[PDB]
């Protein structure tokens, strides 16, 4: 029991320190953009789990008995249920926010908090000391399966579906970095919380604990640490793809055709190079990196057509001079839209 108490105290201290440091850094930097809000709320939920769950776990085991009225037990159990709901629900909210961000280049947090508050309501009736009541056929089975479905099964399945959609759309890079951070967070949450739910289901359906308790208590400190290691701004303070590839290929083809044009000797070579230019410009204008994009590619095609006309007239040097404006248009728009890879 002494070892259990010491381990719980160490975990509580580590979680409190990590979450406090992360919240302090976030507040000092934000003194208001996405990622910051969701991560701050996740850290607040981890702090709620530490304070309202781990501390009662220490306080009951200090004397091996509960000291307080029935309402005290009701409130503490309700708040523990709220926090354990909120962890997964706000991870899901972060994943959905990332999906929204990658779809198109805080309400969800409040929705997750409301879900956590309202889905823990029966905890004000089960415990009444606070010897928990039971149903006539079985009391633990129904609520245990309910908790498994609502905390672990459905949120993890939804996050997996959202991640599948996100990897679809990304592969169809700050956004990629944030997606990877969210994926690591959900993987850590699953790894930390799966054995606890599995053993609670086995205890329900099959009529020791401290090791799984410590393993499930490790997520509340791992999440802020991995976020800090995966975020550049916080680290400093503490101290789609296929279309882009097609655009890059079309732009390099345009550059090669420009090089051919500048070294061309007769009108036939200029005409062939400009034909390849027009094909590449049309193919790139097809791809989605949009009104300015299409307008710039219309300008490019118009310049290519003008150079083609000049080459048809036999004015090779004038055609090359006109096609030199393609470099200016490229530096104006193609490079600007290629700099969007930094977002990705």
């Amino acid at each position, epitope marked *: 029991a002494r070892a259990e108490l010491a381990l719980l105290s160490i975990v509580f201290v580590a979680v409190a320190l990590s979450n406090g440091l992360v919240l302090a850094a976030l507040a000092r930097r934000g003194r208001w953009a996405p990622i910051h809000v969701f991560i701050g709320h996740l850290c607040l939920a981890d702090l709620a789990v530490a304070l309202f769950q781990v501390l009662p776990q220490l306080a009951w085991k200090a004397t091996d008995r509960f000291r307080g009225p029935d309402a005290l037990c009701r409130a503490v159990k309700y708040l523990q249920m709220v926090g354990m709901y909120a962890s997964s629900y706000m991870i899901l909210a972060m994943t959905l926010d990332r999906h929204r961000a990658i779809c198109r280049p805080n309400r969800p947090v409040l929705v997750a908090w409301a879900f956590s508050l309202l889905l823990s309501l029966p905890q004000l009736f089960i415990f009444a000391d606070c010897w928990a009541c039971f149903a006539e056929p079985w009391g633990r089975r129904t609520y245990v399966t309910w908790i498994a479905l609502m905390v672990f099964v459905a949120p993890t399945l939804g996050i997996a579906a959202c991640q599948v959609l996100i990897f679809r759309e990304i592969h169809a890079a700050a956004v990629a970095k944030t997606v990877r951070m969210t994926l690591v967070i959900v993987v850590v949450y699953v790894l930390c919380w799966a054995p606890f739910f599995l053993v609670q289901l086995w205890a329900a359906w099959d009529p020791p604990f401290v090791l799984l308790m410590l393993l499930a208590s490790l997520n509340s400190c791992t999440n802020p640490w991995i976020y800090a290691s995966f975020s550049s701004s916080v680290s400093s303070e503490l101290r789609a793809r296929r279309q882009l590839a097609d655009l890059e290929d079309n732009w390099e083809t345009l550059n090669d055709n420009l090089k051919v044009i500048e070294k061309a000797d007769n009108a036939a070579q200029v005409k*062939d190079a400009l*034909t*390849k230019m*027009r*094909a*590449a410009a*049309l*193919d790139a204008q*097809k791809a989605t990196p949009m009104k300015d994009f299409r307008h710039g590619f*219309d300008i490019l*095609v*118009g310049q290519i*057509d003008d150079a*083609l*006309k000049l080459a*048809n*007239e036999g004015k090779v040097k004038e055609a090359q001079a006109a096609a030199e404006q393609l470099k200016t248009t490229r530096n104006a728009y193609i490079q600007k839209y290629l700099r969007a890879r930094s977002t990705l």
Partner: antibody, heavy 124, light 109 residues
């Protein structure tokens, strides 16, 4: 509706001259480039020439380069194809098609409207 | 200098069948490929433009598809009016338009 009609087709001796005409009604020639396409009897389609009324740019195919001259007249909304040195391979049917200007959807609609064409036959 | 190679020079099918005509460009012409239908003794009529968009006025039984430099015209249901000649044409530029050899659709017997 808008349409294109053709005239001036007929029978000429080899090495002669003939000016085909293409009257477009319902639309202006300054909005569309006008192309002359040729189909030999029993053979497939073959592009011959094109004229851009607005920019004044014109082009011809290799087989008719130098012998044909295509011009436009926006006063009558007509296109003219003067054909000279007509060899025996020019017996065909000539169609006068329109084509929109870049940019936009009109350019993607290639040869949306045609004319009925005129039969040009050369023989001694 | 860009050749369109319409593979089936002749096709035979009955009413109600699904037929497919394939055309191949020498170079990359993006999606600038059109499909025309010509009956004997009449001017060609535009069926498909931009290699996928059917022209406003033609029935919906005609469709077009692109895969790299391979373009495909598909007629899902044959009709008595469908039997005619079909041409593929690339229109990358005004002075570079080339037509295919054609595909005559006959009646199976």
């Amino acid at each position: 509706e808008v349409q294109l009609v053709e005239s001036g087709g007929g029978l000429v001796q080899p090495g002669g001259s003939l000016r085909l005409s293409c009257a477009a009604s319902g639309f202006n020639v300054v909005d569309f480039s006008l192309h002359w396409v040729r189909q030999a009897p029993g053979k497939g389609l073959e592009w011959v020439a094109y004229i851009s009324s607005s920019s004044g740019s014109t082009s011809y195919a290799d087989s008719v380069k130098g012998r044909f001259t295509i011009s436009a007249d926006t006063s009558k909304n007509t296109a003219y194809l003067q054909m000279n040195s007509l060899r025996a391979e020019d017996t065909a049917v000539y169609y006068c098609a329109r084509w929109g200007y870049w940019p936009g959807e009109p350019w993607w609609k290639a040869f949306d409207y045609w004319g009925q064409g005129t039969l040009v036959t050369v023989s001694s | 200098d860009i050749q369109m190679t319409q593979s089936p020079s002749s096709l035979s099918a009955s009413v109600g069948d699904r037929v497919t005509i394939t055309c191949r460009a020498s170079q990359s012409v993006s999606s600038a490929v059109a499909w025309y239908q010509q009956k004997p003794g009449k001017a060609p009529k535009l069926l498909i433009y931009s290699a996928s968009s059917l022209y406003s006025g033609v029935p919906s039984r005609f469709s077009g598809s692109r895969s790299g430099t391979d373009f495909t015209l598909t007629i899902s249901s044959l009709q008595p009016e469908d039997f005619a000649t079909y041409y593929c044409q690339q229109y990358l530029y005004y002075s570079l338009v080339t037509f295919g050899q054609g595909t005559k659709v006959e009646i199976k017997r």
